[PDB]
Scaffold this active site. Structure first.
Site, short mmCIF file in Angstrom:
data_model
loop_
_atom_site.label_atom_id
_atom_site.label_comp_id
_atom_site.label_asym_id
_atom_site.label_seq_id
_atom_site.Cartn_x
_atom_site.Cartn_y
_atom_site.Cartn_z
N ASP A 108 -6.86 16.85 -9.77
CA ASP A 108 -7.66 16.03 -8.88
C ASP A 108 -6.99 15.92 -7.51
O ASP A 108 -5.98 15.23 -7.37
CB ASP A 108 -7.87 14.64 -9.48
CG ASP A 108 -9.00 13.86 -8.82
OD1 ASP A 108 -9.99 14.48 -8.38
OD2 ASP A 108 -8.91 12.62 -8.78
N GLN A 153 0.83 -1.19 0.00
CA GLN A 153 0.00 0.00 0.00
C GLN A 153 0.87 1.25 0.00
O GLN A 153 2.07 1.17 0.28
CB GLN A 153 -0.93 0.03 1.22
CG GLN A 153 -2.17 -0.85 1.11
CD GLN A 153 -1.88 -2.34 1.11
OE1 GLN A 153 -1.75 -2.96 0.05
NE2 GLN A 153 -1.77 -2.92 2.29
N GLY A 186 1.15 5.58 -1.77
CA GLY A 186 0.68 6.49 -2.80
C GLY A 186 0.98 5.99 -4.20
O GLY A 186 1.46 6.74 -5.03
N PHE A 187 0.69 4.71 -4.44
CA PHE A 187 0.92 4.08 -5.73
C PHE A 187 0.53 2.61 -5.67
O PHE A 187 -0.32 2.16 -6.42
CB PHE A 187 2.39 4.20 -6.15
CG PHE A 187 2.66 3.71 -7.54
CD1 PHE A 187 2.45 4.53 -8.63
CD2 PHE A 187 3.12 2.42 -7.76
CE1 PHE A 187 2.68 4.08 -9.92
CE2 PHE A 187 3.35 1.96 -9.04
CZ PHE A 187 3.13 2.79 -10.12
N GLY A 188 1.18 1.89 -4.77
CA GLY A 188 0.96 0.46 -4.65
C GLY A 188 2.26 -0.30 -4.78
O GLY A 188 3.21 0.20 -5.37
#
Length: 360
Positions: free
Chosen positions: A177, A45, A47-49
Site C-alpha cells: 500500500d 503527528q 509517519g506513525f503518531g
C-alpha cells in the site's frame, strides 16, 4: 402540493493541544549511539503518531542533534523491529553515498539515522528512533492542494520511488500500500522526500531467493485495499510487477484527482474489477482517464511496458525511468524547480503493523 424543508449544517471539530508543564519537556534520553537526546515539543503527528521533536542542549553551537525528531514505539515490538532494522541498515552515510553515486541513482527517500534506543518509563519500556525532522506530509497536502499534482510533481515523486523501490525490492521487502501518508517531506527541504511506515513491508525474496507468487492463502493485505492491489490483498508476495502496479495507481491518482475504485472504496468486487478493467487496455484506458488537454502518455506507455514484462520476465526500472523522463522532457520539463510540493502542511495518518500471519 409544495412543502419547505431544510435543517442540517455545521460539522467541524478541532481540539488538539500540547502543553505538558509537569514532566515531558527536557527529558533527556541516551540512545545506543550514546547521545542523551533532550526531547522538546510533542508534535503528535508524523509517519506513525505521538512523534516528539528534539530540542537538545543548546550549549553554543549544536551540531546536527537539533534538526531531528523521534518516533516512540512500545517495547512489545510491532513494526519497530522490521522498520528500525532496515532503517539502521539502509541509513548509512558511507553506503548511501557509494551506491547512490555508482548506481546513478537520484535520491534515496529514507530519513537519516541519527540514533535509537530503549527507555523504560513508569515501568513501560518505550523504544525510540531518531529520524530527520518532518513537517510536511502528502496526506494533509492531498487535502490542502486538492490532490492537484502536475506531471513534474508526479514524475519527481515516482522518480525517487523508483530509486528506493529498486534498493529495497532487490533484497527482500515490498510495500503493497503506497499511501500519501508514507511520503514525508523534509521540514526545511521540500525537494527531498522520505518514506516511512515500514509496517507494510512484507518479504518476497528472503535473503535473495526469488521464490514464486503463491504466498496467498486467503487474505493478508498489507495496507488499504486501495493501492495494495489484488496481489497483496490476497496475501501473495508480488514481484517487480506488483511494485510497478502500485506505483502506477498512485501516479494516476495524483494526476487525475481521484481513483474510480476509491469512490467505490466500499466493495472488494468493484476495486478488483476496476483494476483489471483498466489493465486490459492500459494505453487506451490511461489516456482516456483524464481527456481534456492533458498528456497521460508517459503513464500509458509506462503501464503498457510494465504489462509487457509479464510478472518478472524483463523488469527494468531505469527503462521506465527513461520513458517517464523522456515524456516529461518532451513537454519541456526536467526536475522542474525542485519538485512542486511546498504546501508544507502537517496532518497525515498513522503507521501500521506488519501482516506476519494474524493480527487479533
Amino acid at each position: 402540493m409544495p412543502r419547505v424543508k431544510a435543517a442540517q449544517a455545521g460539522r467541524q471539530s478541532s481540539a488538539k493541544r500540547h502543553l505538558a508543564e509537569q514532566f515531558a519537556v527536557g527529558e533527556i534520553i541516551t540512545d545506543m549511539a550514546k547521545k542523551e537526546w533532550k526531547v522538546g515539543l510533542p508534535i503528535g503527528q508524523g509517519g506513525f503518531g505521538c512523534i516528539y521533536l528534539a530540542d537538545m542542549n543548546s550549549s553554543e553551537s549544536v551540531g546536527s542533534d537539533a534538526p531531528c525528531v523521534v518516533k516512540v514505539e512500545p517495547s512489545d515490538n510491532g513494526p519497530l523491529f522490521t522498520e528500525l532494522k532496515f532503517y539502521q541498515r539502509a541509513a548509512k552515510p558511507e553506503q548511501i553515498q557509494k551506491w547512490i553515486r555508482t548506481r546513478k541513482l537520484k535520491y534515496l527517500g529514507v530519513p537519516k539515522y541519527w540514533g535509537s534506543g530503549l527507555h523504560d518509563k513508569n515501568g513501560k519500556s518505550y523504544r525510540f528512533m531518531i529520524m530527520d525532522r518532518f513537517g510536511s506530509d502528502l496526506q494533509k497536502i492531498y487535502e490542502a492542494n486538492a490532490k492537484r499534482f502536475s506531471r513534474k510533481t508526479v514524475l519527481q515523486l515516482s522518480l525517487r520511488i523508483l530509486d528506493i523501490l529498486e534498493y529495497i525490492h532487490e533484497h527482500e521487502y515490498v510495500h503493497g500500500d503506497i499511501k500519501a501518508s508514507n511520503l514525508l517531506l523534509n521540514y526545511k527541504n521540500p525537494d527531498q522526500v522520505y518514506l516511512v511506515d515500514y509496517g507494510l513491508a512484507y518479504r518476497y525474496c528472503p535473503e535473495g531467493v526469488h521464490k514464486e507468487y503463491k504466498e496467498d492463502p486467503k487474505r493478508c493485505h498489507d495496507g488499504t485495499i486501495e493501492f495494495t492491489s489484488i496481489d497483496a490483498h490476497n496475501g501473495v508476495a508480488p514481484s517487480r510487477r506488483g511494485d510497478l502496479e502500485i506505483l502506477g495507481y498512485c501516479m494516476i491518482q495524483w494526476l487525475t484527482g481521484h481513483l474510480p475504485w476509491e469512490d467505490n472504496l466500499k466493495d472488494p468486487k468493484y476495486v478488483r474489477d476496476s483494476k483489471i478493467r483498466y489493465r486490459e487496455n492500459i494505453a487506451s484506458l490511461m489516456d482516456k482517464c483524464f481527456p481534456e488537454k492533458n498528456k497521460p502518455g508517459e503513464i500509458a506507455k509506462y503501464m503498457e511496458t510494465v504489462k509487457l514484462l509479464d510478472y518478472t520476465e524483463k523488469p527494468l526500472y531505469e527503462n521506465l525511468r527513461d520513458i517517464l523522463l523522456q515524456g516529461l522532457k518532451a513537454i519541456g520539463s526536467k526536475d522542474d524547480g525542485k519538485l512542486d510540493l511546498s504546501v508544507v502542511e502537517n496532518g497525515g495518518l498513522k503507521a501500521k503493523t506488519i501482516t506476519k500471519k494474524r493480527k487479533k
